[PDB]
Design a protein around this ligand. Structure first.
Ligand SMILES: [Zn+2]
Lengths: 119, 119
C-alpha cells in the first residue's frame, strides 16, 4: 500500500521527504498525462502503467493492497510469501523506489503548471 | 472513463478546462490530503470518496469504465443502459460537474505547495 510504498522511498532516498515526489513533473504523485520532463518524472510514468497492469487482476487495488517487503541497507526486497496481486504491486513500488534513487531531482520540475507543461 | 468526466466539466463549466481542476487545492487532481481548503476542492474530495465507494463493486475501474450519459444544454443525465459499475461511476462524475459549476474558482488555489498547505 501507500504507506509501504512511501516507506520504500524513505529507504532509498533518506535525504528527501516523500512529499517531494507528490507533485513532481507531469506524472509524479498526481494522475498523469502528457510527456515526461526528466528521468524522474519518467519513473513515475512507468509506475502508473505498472499499477494499471496490476488492475488486470481481479480484486487487485495497488493503493489499498498490503504486501510483504523489506528495506535493508537501502536494498528493497519483495518477499516470496506474496499472492499474485501483492507480488505485482510490490514489484512496481520496488522498481519505482529504485528509479527514484538514481534519477536526478530538479527543483524547477516540482509543482509545475500542468496546463502549460503536460497536455 | 476519465475522458467522459472531462466532457461533463465542459458541459457545466464551458468557460474552463479540466486542467483548471487538474491541480487545484488539496483534493482536486487526484490524491487528496489535509483540509479541503475550499468548497470547490471539497467537491473534489467528495468525488474521491465516491470513487472509493464505487471501487467496492467487483472489477469496477472508475477511471476506465466507459458509461452512457447525455449533456443537453448544460444538463447532465446518466442514462439507464449502464450496469452497476457504470451507473455508480457516472453518478459520481455527474455530481462533481454540478458541484464544480456551483462553486467559485479561486485562482490563488491553483498550484499550491501541497507540502505547506495539505499536511
Ligand atoms: Zn502542482
Amino acid at each position: 500500500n501507500t504507506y509501504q510504498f512511501q516507506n520504500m522511498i524513505q529507504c532509498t532516498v533518506p535525504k528527501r521527504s516523500w512529499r517531494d515526489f507528490a507533485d513532481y513533473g507531469c506524472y509524479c504523485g498526481r494522475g498523469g498525462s502528457g510527456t515526461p520532463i526528466d528521468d524522474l518524472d519518467s519513473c513515475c510514468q512507468v509506475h502508473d502503467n505498472c499499477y494499471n497492469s496490476a488492475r488486470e487482476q481481479g480484486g487487485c487495488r495497488p493503493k489499498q493492497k498490503t504486501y510483504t517487503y523489506q528495506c535493508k541497507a537501502g536494498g528493497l526486497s519483495c518477499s516470496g510469501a506474496n499472492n499474485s496481486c501483492a507480488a505485482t504491486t510490490c514489484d512496481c513500488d520496488r522498481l519505482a523506489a529504485i528509479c527514484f534513487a538514481g534519477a536526478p531531482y530538479n527543483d524547477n520540475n516540482y509543482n509545475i503548471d500542468l496546463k502549460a507543461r503536460c497536455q | 472513463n476519465t475522458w467522459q468526466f472531462k466532457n461533463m466539466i465542459s458541459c457545466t463549466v464551458p468557460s474552463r478546462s479540466w486542467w483548471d481542476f487538474a491541480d487545484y487545492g488539496c483534493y482536486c487532481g487526484r490524491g487528496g490530503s489535509g483540509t479541503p481548503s475550499d468548497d470547490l476542492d471539497r467537491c473534489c474530495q467528495t468525488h474521491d470518496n465516491c470513487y472509493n465507494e464505487a471501487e467496492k463493486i467487483s472489477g469496477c475501474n472508475p477511471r476506465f469504465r466507459t458509461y452512457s450519459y447525455a449533456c443537453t444544454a448544460g444538463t447532465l443525465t446518466c442514462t439507464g443502459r449502464n450496469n452497476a459499475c457504470a451507473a455508480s461511476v457516472c453518478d459520481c462524475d455527474r455530481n462533481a460537474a454540478i458541484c464544480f459549476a456551483g462553486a467559485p474558482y479561486n485562482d490563488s488555489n491553483y498550484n499550491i505547495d501541497l507540502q505547506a498547505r495539505c499536511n
